[PDB]
Amino acid sequence: SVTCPGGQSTSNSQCCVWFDVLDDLQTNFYQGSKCESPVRKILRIVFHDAIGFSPALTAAGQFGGGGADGSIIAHSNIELAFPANGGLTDTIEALRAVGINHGVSFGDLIQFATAVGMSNCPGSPRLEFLTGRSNSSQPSPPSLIPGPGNTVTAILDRMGDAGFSPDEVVDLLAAHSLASQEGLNSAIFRSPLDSTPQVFDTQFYIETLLKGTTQPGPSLGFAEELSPFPGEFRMRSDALLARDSRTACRWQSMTSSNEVMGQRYRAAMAKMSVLGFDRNALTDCSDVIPSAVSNNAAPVIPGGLTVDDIEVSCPSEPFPEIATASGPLPSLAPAP
Ligand code: HEM
Ligand SMILES: *[C@@H]1O[C@H](CO)[C@@H](O[C@@H]2O[C@H](CO)[C@@H](O)[C@H](O)[C@H]2NC(C)=O)[C@H](O)[C@H]1NC(C)=O
Ligand SMILES: [Ca+2]
Ligand SMILES: [Ca+2]
Ligand SMILES: [K+]
Numbered sequence: 001s002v003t004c005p006g007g008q009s010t011s012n013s014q015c016c017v018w019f020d021v022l023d024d025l026q027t028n029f030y031q032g033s034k035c036e037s038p039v040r041k042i043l044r045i046v047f048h049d050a051i052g053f054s055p056a057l058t059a060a061g062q063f064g065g066g067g068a069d070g071s072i073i074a075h076s077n078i079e080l081a082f083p084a085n086g087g088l089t090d091t092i093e094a095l096r097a098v099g100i101n102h103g104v105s106f107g108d109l110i111q112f113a114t115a116v117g118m119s120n121c122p123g124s125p126r127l128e129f130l131t132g133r134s135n136s137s138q139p140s141p142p143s144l145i146p147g148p149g150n151t152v153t154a155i156l157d158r159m160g161d162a163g164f165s166p167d168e169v170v171d172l173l174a175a176h177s178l179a180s181q182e183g184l185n186s187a188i189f190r191s192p193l194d195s196t197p198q199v200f201d202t203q204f205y206i207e208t209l210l211k212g213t214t215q216p217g218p219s220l221g222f223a224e225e226l227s228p229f230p231g232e233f234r235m236r237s238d239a240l241l242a243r244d245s246r247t248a249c250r251w252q253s254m255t256s257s258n259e260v261m262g263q264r265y266r267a268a269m270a271k272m273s274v275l276g277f278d279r280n281a282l283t284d285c286s287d288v289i290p291s292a293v294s295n296n297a298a299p300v301i302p303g304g305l306t307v308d309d310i311e312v313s314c315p316s317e318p319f320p321e322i323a324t325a326s327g328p329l330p331s332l333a334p335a336p
Contacts, residue, residue, distance in 0.1 A: 008288075012325065014131055015285035018112060021102050022288060025116050029094055035121035035178065035198050036336040037190075041091040043175045046084055046114040046272070048072055049107070052140025053275045056161050063138060067276025070106025071137035077137040084147050087183050105135035111273050115289045121178050123200040124293030126263040128270045130282035148184065148235045152244040155237060162275060164268070168242065170250040171268040174261050177204040180335035181233050185221025190334035191233035195302055197335035200292075202261050202299045205254040206322065208234060208242045209310045210301070229303060231332025242313065249314035256299050256320035282333035303329040 002011050004016035027031045046068075053067035065071070072079045076092050079085055099109045110132045110224035131283040144162075146155045159169045177200050180190040212226030212234060227234040240249045254261045274282070301307065301322045312319045 010285065012285065014283045015288055016037045017102060017104060018129075018131065018288045020283055021098065021104060021109070021112060021239050022116060022290075024098055024102070025113055026120075026321075029098065029113070029118060030120055033120045034336075035117070038091065038094075039117035039121060040111070040179055040335070041088060042095075042113050042117050043178065045072060045088060045091065045095075046110050047172075047175075048088075048145060049081075049110050049140075050272045050275045051077075051146075051158075051162055052144050053162055054141065054144050056222060057141060063141065065140040065144060065276070066137050066203055066296055068107050068111065068273055069133065069137040069276055070108075070110055070135065071140050073106040073110070074115075074135075074137050075139040078197050082145060084145040089266050104131075105133055106137070107133035107137070114269075118200065119290045119292045120179075121200050121327055122293045123258055123262070124290060124292040125200075126173070127266060127288070128273070128284070129286045129289050130273065130279060131194075131285050132282040133277055137200060146237070148237045150237060151188075152237075152246065154242050155241070156246065163271065166246050167250045168268045168271070170247050170254065171264040172272070173238070174200070174204070174254065174265040176238065178200055179204075181221075181235065184235065185217050185219075185224055185233065187219070187221075188217035188231075188233065188334075190336075191216055191231060192332050192335045193235070193238070195232065195330060199295055199297070200262065201258050201295055201297070202255055203302075205242070205251055205261070206299060206301060206310075207232065208238050209251070209255070209313070210305060211311055212239070228305070228309070229329040229331065231330070231334075243311065245313075245315075249317055252312070252314040252317055254320065256322055258295055258299070300325050303327050305329075311315055 049072040050068040052065035054064040058064035099106045115129045118124040176193045176231050179193040196203050210228035214227050223236040225234040225239045241247045
């Protein structure tokens with residue numbers, strides 16, 4: 001409907017300020033619309049901000065957390081002391097300055113920066129963006145963040161409390177297709193979790209299913225498992241979720257279609273974005289989100305490996321017929 005000062009047209013007047021936030025984030029935060037570390041860090045922040053929400057705690061008479069309320073920024077002094085929130089300070093401070101300079105709430109800003117960041121990464125879907133989340137928050141309670149050494153039962157329970165089914169947990173983990181680690185094993189800083197850290201694709205689901213044969217660094221870091229080729233890092237929670245009977249068939253169905261994986265992820269992220277809010281009280285400004293370049297590569301089992309190297313864990317569905325590559329094993333360079 002409406003036309004914003006820069007000539008773009010939008011649904012509601014409430015969407016116009018986001019065209020300014022968009023320009024600042026692309027030019028500055030993302031250094032010229034790049035899909036590099038700032039995007040990967042923001043993806044950890046949206047999850048850690050939203051998951052501080054617990055109905056079980058509320059039911060027991062305690063404060064359960066406000067969900068996607070920007071509390072990780074507003075109360076960064078409390079929240080970045082939590083063990084799973086390390087390596088985020090510089091990104092939280094960069095976001096704080098954009099929030100304050102544009103007059104937007106921190107909770108909306110984190111959702112927006114996640115949608116805009118993913119648009120710089122090829123193969124990504126257009127995430128929904130809603131605005132109107134209140135800027136006031138209280139610190140998230142401790143212990144509501146799943147860690148890499150937790151069992152599958154522990155993760156599924158914490159995530160189930162928040163509101164996610166076992167399938168949606170698997171769906172949410174498609175974000176590890178654009179990921180690396182920096183704090184589990186600093187000796188192999190920014191070692192990627194899949195062979196394409198800059199392409200939102202299916203490779204993460206394929207490669208975590210491959211037999212662990214390689215130790216990529218001098219020693220094994222915290223919650224580190226043997227990976228399928230040099231340079232790739234494999235964390236325990238991911239290796240176990242790929243193989244556990246409760247999640248193994250969803251993990252397997254995510255391996256052959258980037259279109260299927262992107263739509264399931266988009267739906268799971270839209271649910272995570274309103275944890276603590278009523279989406280019917282928010283204004284939809286999804287039209288402000290730009291498209292990503294398309295990924296035209298087909299899913300592959302890398303470096304000469306075959307289906308014989310996949311530890312097929314879904315007893316009921318045959319493993320998808322995926323393409324093979326004629327090559328030596330790759331050695332992965334650090335993610336950018
Ligand atoms: C079962 C829950 C999950 C666990 C246990 C988990 C654990 C981890 C760990 C240990 C790292 C490495 C952090 C570091 O040392 O630098 C990581 C990275 C990452 N995770 Fe997850 N994660 C989970 C869910 C998610 C979700 C739901 C998202 C977001 C939608 C997400 C997005 C990312 C991204 C993008 C990175 C890469 C950060 C970077 O490269 O700097 N993770 N995750
Ligand atoms: C959202 O609430 C936060 C927390 O009160 C506000 O952040 C402060 O803003 C002032 C002035 O704008 C800054 O000097 C402080 O440094 C900020 N504090 C923190 C912890 O970041 C923020 O301004 C509020 N946003 C809006 C749009 O009202
Ligand atoms: Ca929060
Ligand atoms: Ca990838
Ligand atoms: K679909």
